[PDB]
Write a protein that binds this ligand. Structure first.
Ligand SMILES: [Mg+2]
Ligand SMILES: [Mg+2]
Ligand SMILES: [Mg+2]
Ligand SMILES: [Mg+2]
Ligand SMILES: [Mg+2]
Ligand SMILES: [Mg+2]
Ligand SMILES: [Mg+2]
Ligand SMILES: [Mg+2]
Ligand SMILES: [Mg+2]
Ligand SMILES: [Mg+2]
Ligand SMILES: [Mg+2]
Ligand SMILES: [Mg+2]
Ligand SMILES: [Mg+2]
Ligand SMILES: [Mg+2]
Ligand SMILES: [Mg+2]
Ligand SMILES: [Mg+2]
Ligand SMILES: [Mg+2]
Ligand SMILES: [Mg+2]
Ligand SMILES: [Mg+2]
Ligand SMILES: [Mg+2]
Ligand SMILES: [Mg+2]
Ligand SMILES: [Mg+2]
Ligand SMILES: [Mg+2]
Ligand SMILES: [Mg+2]
Ligand SMILES: [Mg+2]
Ligand SMILES: [Mg+2]
Lengths: 104, 129, 70, 66, 88, 271
RNA sequence: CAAGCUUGAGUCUCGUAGAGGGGGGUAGAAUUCCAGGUGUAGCGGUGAAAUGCGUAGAGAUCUGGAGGAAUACCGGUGGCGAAGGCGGCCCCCUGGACGAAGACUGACGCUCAGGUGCGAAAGCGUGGGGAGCAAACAGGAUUAGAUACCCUGGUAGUCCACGCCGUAAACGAUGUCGACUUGGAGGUUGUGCCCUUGAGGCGUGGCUUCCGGAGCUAACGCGUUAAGUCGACCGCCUGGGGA
RNA sequence: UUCUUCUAA
């Protein structure tokens, strides 16, 4: 449908709940007959600057080929969850599959 | 838009003479050949030639005497915004008879001098002087 | 211009290094630019006159490169 | 002497920080195209990638803020 | 704009040869589909004046295509606006 | 939709109606009605306590759910109705088990939407959940002051209250007056602004339209005799005195709040 | 008038570039306000001062909070738009341009009185909002005077929604459309080709900047984006005032 | 820093 690139930033004390969040989000996409192309946890990572009075965050990259209606449902899940701090969804021209330069 | 093809022919001659171009090409027409027929016959251009099948291109071979141009002045007289028709008594004398006025008559396109000898007038296409 | 004094460095070296980075990062001319409001007329006119200054002087230097003076 | 014209990438990745750290200064400002010689098509893509990496706390907005 | 499948669904519907894609009824209905698709946009976005100039360009272009079609063939003109539901 | 009336008569010259075509054009729901007898502003002593109240059209009272206790059970919105008792429109809702109730209608609510109270409710305009479950920075209305007491804040036609902070047991609110007030984090609140936001755009147009709403005319104090009012008297128009109440209390500027019980709950006053 | 034809004009296919528009989010820096910690006699301002702020603790500094508005660097005689105009980032809706090859329609075109639409800032109406800036106004200076420039304040306003106004040196002081006429150095954006034997070599489109030849022009200059050579249509001018 | 004006042929 519409290729999106989703990266979100988890509160680092909620790093344990991260694979529980990813499986729900994949089941949101694949349950809505969307594709998921790569899915790359980046772990805890030192922030460039302290967002929200704290210095580290847990990064997750996720590439998604879903219809635009369920992504807008997915964005509200990032908005009201307090575990995720920042979320960025970026529309992509195609489906990307190659590993990240920092997964390397 | 191309409101007037005949004034495009005369302007490509006039800009062709001033730019010292050897030959000038343009899209051909049934009327543009008859004007180039007069200009070759009356001695202002060397030769004309129409080439092509789907879109014919009329090519004019220009004429230069003693370095400078032969066609000193060329002007459109009847134009789509304002047509000019004259009777056979009121045909003009371009440059007191030295130049010619290409006139479209019932017996085809001819010069103004031959229009008087044919004894019938018509529409003045252009002044060539 | 966050500049740490290196180990066994004289102070006049590091101060001169500190003046270098502030001129590099463009601090003094930035605050002086923001001291007063500049209209978008004045900003478009001064940037256009800056381009003609960078262009006609290039043509004046190259024209003066050719011909001699004595 | 634009590097992106030589290597020929269709779009600069904002996640490639080690590439993008060669295009910001020490104080985090975007280095102009006069200095690095970047062709202006990739300069628009590069600025659009630094502004995304600043948003994800991958690059600082300045060296001072904390 | 119009999606790729929606264009070809119109072209094969109103083209005499299913590949003509530029015939007069084909060009009218592609505009009429795009005009009627944008009724919802300007009902929601009334201050999108820059897009509305592109809409009036489509209306003005379609009006010239119908007026050309009227003196070229009347029976195709009656059949086109009756099928597309055009008031004139 | 505001409708300017055409001036066919003076008294219709300046009338702007507020016409809402979504309101129910029928009788209200009969089990939820009860008698609302008028008072005339007179207490059990028969004296006029509050002035200028009297007359007006007969009004039946609509029992409105402010406590909003049906947790977990979803409810669909049947129709929107006119309420003479208040400035905001009310919504007749139908729970799944068959109970009908009236709530205050929020801004974007229409006939056919589903609402639901309780803690596990979603966050859409219409749900009611305790403010330790509502995210900080959202606009809510029908706000309780005490848990289970019923909503008391932001009930008039276009009002709302923002939730600006939370420190454990309390949340800090930005009331519609601009006052910052602490409320316990267990008090219920209803999401979204309350509905009839264009209520303040009406203009009654004529003197009788205020008498329809039971507002008797107000005689201004300087038009009296000195036995009647402190402002009264004078040979002509004389007002050489500071503006007071009919009981001699300064009005232009003098504060009157004297509640030392609730001063710990007020963060900042209105401005 | 009838029948055509494909070059004008248009449709389709695949792509590219973009501060083009509308809507909703969101981020960082800074300003002011509020609270608190440290701290103590100045601060601020100017040509010099004073009004002003300061021992009731300012300014400075650190932490926290609130709120508005604008989006450093990128950034460029760069880009887009019919003009006005458009500048963080993300999404949704959406207009236009251009390119490469074809396919297709067959003159379907150009211009346009009246008409209709858009139209900077200032202003107006209703409802919000209001940090900074700032007419008005106030105080301080300056001066012969100073209803000013300077200073310290400061309200409409600037911001948002919806209406109205319909004007600017709304300028390229150059109406739109088409054709032809020597060149040079660029910018930007496609695309073809050569072994990309490097960011190169050879082309071919769009847009744009500068110089300049013929020609034109009162001159200044314009000069393939014409103010050159022509065609179509529109708008307009007729001494300076009065106006 | 402020710093104005000058008729007659
Ligand atoms: Mg199209
Ligand atoms: Mg009263
Ligand atoms: Mg009254
Ligand atoms: Mg009264
Ligand atoms: Mg009396
Ligand atoms: Mg008394
Ligand atoms: Mg009296
Ligand atoms: Mg008196
Ligand atoms: Mg053909
Ligand atoms: Mg054919
Ligand atoms: Mg036009
Ligand atoms: Mg305005
Ligand atoms: Mg006024
Ligand atoms: Mg206003
Ligand atoms: Mg107002
Ligand atoms: Mg203010
Ligand atoms: Mg001032
Ligand atoms: Mg005017
Ligand atoms: Mg302008
Ligand atoms: Mg200009
Ligand atoms: Mg003008
Ligand atoms: Mg020139
Ligand atoms: Mg001339
Ligand atoms: Mg011209
Ligand atoms: Mg001229
Ligand atoms: Mg005097």
């Amino acid at each position: 449908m519409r290729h999106y690139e989703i990266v979100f930033m988890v509160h680092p004390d909620q790093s344990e709940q991260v694979p529980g969040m990813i499986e729900r989000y994949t089941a949101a996409i694949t349950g809505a007959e969307g594709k998921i192309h790569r899915l790359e946890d980046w772990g805890r990572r030192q922030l460039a600057y302290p967002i929200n009075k704290l210095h580290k965050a847990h990064y997750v990259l996720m590439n998604v080929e879903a219809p635009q209606e369920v992504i807008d449902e997915l964005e509200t899940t990032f908005r009201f969850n307090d575990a995720v701090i920042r979320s960025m969804v970026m529309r992509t021209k195609h489906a990307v599959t190659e590993a990240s330069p920092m997964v390397k | 838009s191309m409101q007037d093809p005949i004034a495009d022919m005369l302007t490509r001659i006039r800009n062709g003479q001033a730019a010292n171009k050897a030959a000038v090409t343009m899209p051909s027409s049934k009327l543009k050949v008859a004007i180039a027929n007069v200009l070759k016959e009356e001695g202002f251009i060397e030769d004309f030639k129409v080439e092509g099948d789907t879109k014919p291109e009329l090519e004019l071979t220009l004429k230069y005497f003693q370095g400078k141009a032969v066609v000193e002045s060329i002007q459109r007289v009847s134009r789509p915004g304002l047509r000019i028709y004259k009777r056979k008594d009121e045909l003009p004398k371009v440059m007191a008879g030295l130049g010619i006025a290409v006139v479209s008559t019932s017996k085809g396109v001819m010069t103004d001098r031959a229009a008087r000898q044919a004894g019938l007038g018509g529409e003045i296409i252009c002044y060539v002087a | 211009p966050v500049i740490k004094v290196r180990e066994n460095e004289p102070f006049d070296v590091a101060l001169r290094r500190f003046k270098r980075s502030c001129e590099k990062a463009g601090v003094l001319a930035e605050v002086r630019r923001r001291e007063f409001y500049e209209k978008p007329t004045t900003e478009r006119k001064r940037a256009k006159a800056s381009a003609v200054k960078r262009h006609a002087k290039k043509l004046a230097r190259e024209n003066a490169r050719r011909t001699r003076l004595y | 002497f634009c590097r992106f014209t030589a290597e020929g990438v269709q779009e600069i990745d904002y996640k490639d920080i080690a590439t993008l750290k060669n295009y910001i200064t020490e104080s985090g400002k975007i280095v102009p195209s006069r200095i690095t010689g970047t062709r202006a098509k990739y300069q628009r893509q590069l600025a659009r990638a630094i502004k995304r990496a600043r948003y994800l706390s991958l690059l600082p907005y300045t060296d001072r803020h904390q | 704009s119009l999606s790729t499948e929606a264009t070809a669904k119109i072209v094969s519907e109103f083209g005499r040869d299913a590949n003509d894609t530029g015939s007069t009824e084909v060009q009218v209905a592609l505009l009429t589909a795009q005009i009627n698709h944008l009724q919802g946009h300007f009902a929601e976005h009334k201050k999108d004046h820059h897009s509305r100039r592109g809409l009036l360009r489509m209306v003005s272009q379609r009006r010239k295509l119908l007026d050309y079609l009227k003196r070229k063939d009347v029976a195709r003109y009656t059949q086109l606006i009756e099928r597309l539901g055009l008031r004139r | 939709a505001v409708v300017k009336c055409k001036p066919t008569s003076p008294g219709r010259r300046h009338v702007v109606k507020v016409v809402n075509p979504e309101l129910h054009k029928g009788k209200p729901f009969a089990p939820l009605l009860e008698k609302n007898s008028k008072s005339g502003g007179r207490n059990n002593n028969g004296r006029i306590t509050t002035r200028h109240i009297g007359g007006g059209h007969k009004q039946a009272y609509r029992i409105v759910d402010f406590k909003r206790n049906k947790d977990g059970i979803p409810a669909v919105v049947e129709r929107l109705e006119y309420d003479p008792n208040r400035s905001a429109n009310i919504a007749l809702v139908l729970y799944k088990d068959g109970e009908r109730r009236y709530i205050l209608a929020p801004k974007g609510l229409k006939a056919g939407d589903q609402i639901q109270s309780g803690v596990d409710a979603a966050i859409k305009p219409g749900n009611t959940l305790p403010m330790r479950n509502i995210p900080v920075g959202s606009t809510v209305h029908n706000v309780e002051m005490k848990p289970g007491k019923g909503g008391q804040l932001a009930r008039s036609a276009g009002t709302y209250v923002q939730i600006v902070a939370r420190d454990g047991a309390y949340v800090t609110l930005r009331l519609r007056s601009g006052e910052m007030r602490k409320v316990e984090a267990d008090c219920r609140a209803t999401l979204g602004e309350v509905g009839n936001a264009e209520h303040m755009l009406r203009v009654l147009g004529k003197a009788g339209a205020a008498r329809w709403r039971g507002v008797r005319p107000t005689v201004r104090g300087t038009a009296m005799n000195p036995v009647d009012h402190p402002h009264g008297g004078g040979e002509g128009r004389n007002f050489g005195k500071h503006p007071v109440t009919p009981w001699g209390v300064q009005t232009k500027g003098k504060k009157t709040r004297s509640n030392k019980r609730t001063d710990k709950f007020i963060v900042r006053r209105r401005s």
